Structures are given as structure tokens and as C-alpha cells.
Amino acid sequence: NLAPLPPHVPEHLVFDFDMYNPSNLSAGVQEAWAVLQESNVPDLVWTRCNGGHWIATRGQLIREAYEDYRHFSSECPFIPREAGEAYDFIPTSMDPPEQRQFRALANQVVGMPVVDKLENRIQELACSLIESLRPQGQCNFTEDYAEPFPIRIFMLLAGLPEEDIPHLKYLTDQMTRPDGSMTFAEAKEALYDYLIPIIEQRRQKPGTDAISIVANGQVNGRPITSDEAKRMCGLLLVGGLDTVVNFLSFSMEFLAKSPEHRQELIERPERIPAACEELLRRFSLVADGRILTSDYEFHGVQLKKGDQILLPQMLSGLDERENAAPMHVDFSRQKVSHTTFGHGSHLCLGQHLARREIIVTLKEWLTRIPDFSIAPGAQIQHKSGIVSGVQALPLVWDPATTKAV
């Protein structure tokens, strides 16, 4: 489905990349996107897929556009446009300067100080999940560890009850794993519908959970509205789910296929934080974007007001112009540059929580289950979109090589 080429887009910049079903996807999703960085592909191209939009293909342009919020607005951040148009999460759908105070409030509840009182539940959570799988000699890592882990952490951050996990999980999957049964807007309303009463409850009777802080916060002078509070809690919920689920999956798929990298981390556990950083670069997975606020020439290319531009956070660290031999994982890589957590005013607020979740997972898994493999005969399937991922991750190990800890 190739949308008619707008008159202002020259034909030499056309490259019909499909972000939801890239060709060569079977070879790995990062590799599928990296086709945009082969030598005969311009720094900035137009695809007619998914309604028609620009794609910046190089770290320098991706970073620049993310810095220039005046021209590249978060008001419509998703492709296709209809999804971008409905989306009203806070602060991701706002531009500076109104975004600033909402980001400050969100930061209180997911920021670096909060990551200390949570560490213990994160550690405990990772250990009991791993210990439950360890004697089986197999799991589907995506389903059995990756999925339950971040939602359980969010419940403890937001002071919500465990029994709600399955309902909430059903709601969020309906939003981010579309089978096409309902529109983005439709799924989002279903989600808000759960959240609306909880905010009502916690505005009248506030506690000390993240939802209570948000719903009773002060922004831009005055108290936050119930509408604003819902739009914030919606994003605090979903922001840390698919990203962490899919990232851990990519990481574990790599370690399962790489005994030498496994052993490196087993022999030298102090290298885990650095290995986390290099995996973050290599298996970067987010791609959202911006909408042009005005006509604007960007690196020799005429962009038109209302044009959408995909600015793939994924691509910056895969750019061979900023990391030599980018497809190779080197835990001893000396200057690891990436925009995996974004760039500019919307830089991931959960990046510190995310790193703890990743580092704790790797530390605790390698200690209990040092030697594991991809199940024999399994072909690992990837999916591509705004948050790329792993369909399933069947792993196997000999329980006799494991230790209860």
C-alpha cells in the first residue's frame, strides 16, 4: 500500500521501507532496519508505506531533529498518522515548554532516587521468577520471565494490587499488540477506563504510591487535573512494559546464541553494567517520531508543515559513522554511543529503572543458570514497529548445571 508521493518530495529520495513489516525481517529486526544505512541510501529518505513519511537514517540527523522540538513536534509522534493523532499520553504527546513541568513531576515517581527503595523488590522479584524456572530445564523466556517482570515492578511503584495484574496485562496488550480488532483510540479508552476511578479514589484519599503523587501534583502553577493525571499514569504504566520485555528478550536471545559472551560475564561479573550498555546499543528497539510544525529545510531536504518524520532511536547506535563495526557486540567497546532511551527533551525518564531491571536480570540469571541455549530446531521470530521485539524465546538448559541461590 504505497500512498501517492506528495509533489514536494523528489523521487530520488524515495525508499519504501515498511516499519511494521520490513523485508529481511527474518534475518533479525535490527538487521532489517539497518538496510536504511547501506551506502546508496540517503541520510534522509521518504517512504510511501504506512501513509507516507520521512525517515532519518543516521545518528546525526536523528539527534538533531530530537533536539529541535520547535520544528519537530511530539504532538503527533506515531506512524501512522491516525495513531499519532489519537495519542494523548503525558508527557510524550507534549512539546516544551508545557512538557517541562509534567516531566518534572513524572521524574519524582520513576527517577534515580526512587530506584533505590525499589532495588530490593526488583532483586527479590528477579530471584523468585528465576528460581521458579530453574529446575524445569526449559522456559519461554519472553512469556515466563520477560512479561511478568516489569508489570510486577510497576504494581509496586504504583501501589496497585497483584490481583489486578492479569486485567491490566490484558488492557495493555490490547493497546500495544493489535490484532486489528480495535483502533488505537479504542484500546486507549479501555485502558483509561480502568485508571479513571483509581485516580478519583486517590485524589480524595491520597496515599504515597506513584499514582497518588501524580494525581495530586502541582504543574505550571496550579493543581494537576484528573484528565492530566490519567494521561500521565497511562504512560507510566505502558512506557516500561514492552520496551523492557522486548529488550530483555533480545539480550537473552543473544546470550543464548553466544557462549563466549556468556562466559565473559560469568568469569567477570563486574563487566555486566558495561555489557548492559553495549546490548542497549546493539539491540536498540524503539522508533517513534515527530510532525513538522512548519515548512523547513533540513539537511538540504524541503520538509512541509504536517509531514511526519520517523526518527528511529534504534538506528543511531547502529550507525557505523558513530560505532565502528556496529553489528558486532563488544563488551569492551570504549565509546558506546546510542540514543536507545531517546534524545532531547523527552529522554526516557525510566532509563535508570530500566538499567537496574536489565542489570539485575543478567546478574541473577547468569548466577543461577550460567549455561543455556536456544531450544533445538527453534527459529526465533522478531516483530517490527514502534517498539520492535521477539515473538517468543524458547530456552533450554541442564538443571544439573544450575544452582538454587
Ligand code: HEM
Ligand atoms: C529498555 C527499556 C526502555 C526503553 C528502550 C525506553 C525508551 C524510551 C524512549 C525512546 C523514549 C522517548 C520517546 C520520545 O522522544 O517520544 C522514552 C520516554 C519515556 N520513558 Fe522510556 N524506555 C524504557 C523504559 C522505561 C521505563 C521502565 C519507564 C518507567 C515506567 C519509562 C518511562 C518513560 C517516560 C515517562 C517517557 C516520556 C518522557 C517525556 O516525555 O518527557 N521508560 N523511553
Ligand SMILES: CN(C)c1cccc2c(S(=O)(=O)NCCOCCOCCNC(=O)[C@]34C[C@H]5C[C@H](C[C@H](C5)C3)C4)cccc12
Ligand atoms: C494505516 N493502517 C491501516 C495501519 C497500518 C499499521 C498499523 C496501524 C495501527 S497500529 O495498531 O499498528 N498502531 C498502534 C500501535 O502503536 C502502539 C504503541 O502505543 C503504545 C503506547 N506506547 C508508548 O506510549 C511509548 C511512548 C514512548 C515511545 C515508545 C516506547 C515507550 C516510550 C512507550 C512508545 C493503527 C491504525 C492503522 C494502522
Ligand SMILES: [K+]
Ligand atoms: K496527538
